[model samples]
Target: GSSGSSGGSAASSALKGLIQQFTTITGASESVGKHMLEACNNNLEMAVTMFLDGGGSGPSSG
Candidate 1:
């Protein structure tokens, strides 16, 4: 795990920067940033919006 190049997605430099940016703003680690960003279909604005609103998933009605 020393290569700093793990994960399935290739070096999508665009998204790579997004991950770092997301992490910086939200204080989330790289993995969590990737999770939030990827979960929202790579839509940063939407992700940030939902992420701030509360956990971002509106299902199960729990």
Candidate 2:
């Protein structure tokens, strides 16, 4: 469970790095990267919170 969760966290953390690499290689300002990151974070938080609260646990007990 921890590994699965860590994988999720690592995937999320990679977003920033990817954005930074794109901006550096493209010679673009980092602000757009930062803004995109914030938007992604906000949306991801909303999605996970909604799914966790609304989606049922694995399966119901008999």
Winning candidate number (TM-score): 1
In the range 1-62, model 2's lDDT, one tens digit per residue, is 35543434444556656556535543334565545445556343433344345443644544
Cα lDDT over the full model 1: 0.71
Top candidate, metric lDDT: 1
lDDT of 1 by residue, 3-52 (tens): 78657776477776877877776666777767778887876676677676
TM-score of 2: 0.29
* Per-residue lDDT value at 41 in model 1: 81
**In model 2, what is the error at residue 10, expressed in angstroms?**
16
Model 1 — TM-score against the truth? 0.63
* Residue 59 displacement (Å), model 2: 52
